[PDB]
Design a protein around this ligand. Structure first.
Ligand code: MG
Ligand code: MG
Lengths: 132, 84, 101, 229, 138
């Protein structure tokens, strides 16, 4: 049987998100892409460096906002800019969010040598697409 | 019904037509002049009011690319001509 | 802090091959010709063979940058077939989708 | 006493001209900043300093006019002299674009508004605020604390004086985009709806108050209920 | 009621040197999504009409690059997975521009280039014969 990126059915008590409920054969039919850049286009270059930056960002943000991320990130590149769009929870205090936004935006700008901006969208609870 | 500007004034200083032609431009500003210029850049200091201004600030600093895109920006091979 | 020692040995090889790249280039030019004397070409055969082994570019291996896997590596992403699919199957690689036709 | 100080200062000025030293804008600003202590006496000397600046072709900056209004301004009921001064300054400043010259140039707008509030003149506040929008003069308003104070004296004077249909257009523009109101501003706005017999908006002024952090303000809740009942 | 009484506009000085001419300006944008290109076309075409520029649009054929990989971590050769990257094109052919007009239009659309969309701008300049070419020296 196939296993990649599939959430196995259960009794019915397990909540899943939209992206987590669709398998790889829906990535261009019912889902989009979590990262958007030009590396993988025909005739373009530096697709390998853009991938290592993505892998590091998803981990930097998972450990920098522990227990706060409601769903996967959405990385966007428009020229020199790098826009990180995240959906976070409302448990943490806003004072601590503004601290981490300025700490991460700055640390990542000096690391990758690019202007970085972070966009948060708070939700009360993790959105549920269905129950498996 | 009298304007404030019109009336008696102090006559200690004579009116000046022009200033000194050439100052000590070669001499570099002192600490007192470098710290006083930082106080004149704070009066007009204000937070970014819109998205466009952020782009403008970044572009001046040098973080954001200058458009239209030139693939050779910041790369002149020592001012070398083709015959070299 | 690399994945394994096999990876670490390749990092050193790519560094030593970058320092001697020009010296090796200039010497090989003498060997790859029929113009210069054989006596001179014989001396260049011994000078480039006395350079360290790790300076030779053929001793470099394109391993995966995440798992250090020597085989099954895609050169465009520098990833192994197993790691590439893990990111592509979760929609983390821009433009990559599954093919059907 | 001032009479002794004035003579002392004139000596340094006579020495400045005796050593071939030309004064700058800062030289004149210190004089005005120093003269602030002697509110009453320094009033006339101050103008003489201003006239001198114009004589040598030194354009007074925003800080220069700031040290003047503070000096002329005094906690008095008549305020006859203060009224005439500010009207003349605006006509001079009207339709101008300013550049940073003195560190205190930012403190001009906060003071000028305070004068209009003490004078209860709305036609003058439209000129002070209309001068803040020309070109890029909005950058001289100053830090947050100076910005909140400017828009409070300004908006509190709008509700009191002008029609209610126009007061509500200023309440939609400024708040919250410009400044976050204080409990008093909500009160003054409530005392304008009463005067205009438009008490149908009270259920909306309470919603916005809770959204601005005034949910647990004793004084506010004690004035909204009385008006409705 | 609150509106800037006066507005400041960026200074545009006129130089003495002559301006550059462009017989054609070919803009080729790539992307993985077609609706993002259909939407970028509508924006770039409308921005040209308002600036007084001639523009023609055509859609070059797409390119699909495929490749296959093993399905399992160990053995099971027969069973594999095939992937593809789809590259869609959209060419905007402008005509009869100047150096300044193109400098403005390109900056306007390059900045608003959406995510996952590249661009290849081919500029065709008009020149005159050099001085040495007018007559022979020998
Ligand atoms: Mg199967
Ligand atoms: Mg090999």
């Amino acid at each position: 049987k196939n296993r990649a990126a599939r959430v196995r059915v259960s009794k019915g008590d397990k909540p899943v998100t939209y992206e987590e409920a669709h398998a790889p054969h829906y990535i261009a039919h019912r889902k989009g892409w979590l990262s958007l850049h030009t590396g993988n286009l025909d005739g373009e270059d530096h697709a390998a460096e853009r991938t290592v930056e993505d892998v590091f960002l998803r981990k930097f943000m998972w450990g920098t906002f522990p227990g706060c991320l409601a769903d996967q990130l959405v990385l966007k590149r428009r020229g020199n800019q790098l826009e990180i769009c995240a959906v976070v929870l409302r448990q943490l205090s806003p004072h601590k969010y503004y601290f981490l936004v300025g700490y991460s935006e700055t640390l990542l700008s000096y690391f990758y040598k690019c202007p970085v901006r972070l966009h948060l969208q708070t939700v009360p609870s993790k959105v549920v697409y269905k129950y498996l | 019904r009298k304007n404030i500007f019109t009336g008696k004034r102090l006559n200690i200083f004579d009116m000046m037509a022009v200033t000194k032609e050439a100052p000590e431009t070669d001499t570099s500003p002192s600490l007192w002049d470098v710290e006083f210029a930082k106080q004149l850049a704070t009066v007009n200091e204000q937070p970014l009011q819109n998205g466009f201004e952020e782009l403008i600030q970044w572009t001046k600093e040098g973080k954001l690319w200058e458009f239209p895109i030139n693939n050779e920006a910041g790369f002149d091979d020592d001012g070398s001509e083709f015959h070299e | 802090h690399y994945v394994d020692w096999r990876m670490w040995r390749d990092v050193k090889r790519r560094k030593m091959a970058y320092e001697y790249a020009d010296e090796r280039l200039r010497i090989n030019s003498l060997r790859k010709n029929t113009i210069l004397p054989k006596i001179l070409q014989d001396v260049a055969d011994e000078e480039i063979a006395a350079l360290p082994r790790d300076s030779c570019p053929v001793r470099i291996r394109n391993r995966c940058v995440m798992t250090s896997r020597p085989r099954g590596v895609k050169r465009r992403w520098r990833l192994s077939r197993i790691v590439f699919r893990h990111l592509a199957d979760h929609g983390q690689l821009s433009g990559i989708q599954r093919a059907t036709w | 006493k001032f009479e002794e100080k004035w003579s002392k200062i004139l000596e340094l000025l006579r020495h400045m001209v005796a050593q071939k030293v030309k004064p700058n804008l800062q030289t004149f600003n210190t004089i005005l900043k120093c003269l602030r202590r002697f509110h009453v006496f320094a009033r006339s000397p101050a103008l003489q300093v201003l006239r001198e600046m114009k004589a040598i072709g030194i354009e007074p900056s925003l800080a220069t006019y700031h040290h003047i209004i503070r000096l002329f301004d005094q906690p008095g009921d008549p305020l006859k002299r203060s009224s005439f001064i500010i009207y003349d300054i605006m006509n001079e400043l009207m339709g101008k674009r300013f550049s940073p010259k003195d560190p205190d140039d930012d403190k001009f707008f906060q003071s000028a508004m305070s004068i209009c509030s003490s004078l209860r003149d709305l036609e003058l506040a439209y000129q002070v605020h209309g001068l803040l929008k020309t070109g890029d003069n909005w950058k001289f308003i100053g830090p947050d604390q100076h910005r909140n104070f400017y828009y409070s004296k300004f908006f509190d004077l709008i509700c009191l004086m002008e029609q209610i249909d126009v007061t509500l257009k200023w309440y939609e523009d400024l708040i919250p985009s410009a400044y976050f109101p204080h409990s008093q501003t909500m009160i003054h706005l409530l005392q304008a709806l009463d005067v205009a017999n438009r008490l149908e908006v009270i259920p909306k002024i309470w919603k916005d108050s809770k959204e601005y952090g005034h949910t647990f303000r004793s004084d506010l809740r004690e004035e909204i209920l009385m008006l409705m009942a | 009621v609150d509106v800037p009484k006066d507005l400041t506009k960026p200074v545009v000085t006129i130089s003495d040197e002559p301006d550059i001419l462009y017989k054609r300006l070919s803009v080729l944008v790539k992307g993985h999504d077609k609706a993002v290109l259909d939407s970028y076309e509508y924006f770039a075409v409308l921005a040209a009409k308002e600036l007084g520029i001639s523009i023609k649009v055509h859609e070059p054929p797409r390119k699909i690059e495929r490749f296959t990989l093993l399905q399992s971590v160990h053995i099971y050769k027969k069973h594999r997975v095939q992937y593809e990257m789809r590259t869609l094109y959209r060419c905007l052919e402008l005509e009869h521009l100047t150096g300044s007009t193109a400098d403005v239009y390109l900056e306007y659309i390059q900045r608003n280039l959406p995510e996952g969309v590249a661009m290849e701008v081919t500029k065709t300049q008009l020149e005159q014969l050099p001085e040495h070419i007018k007559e022979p020296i020998w």
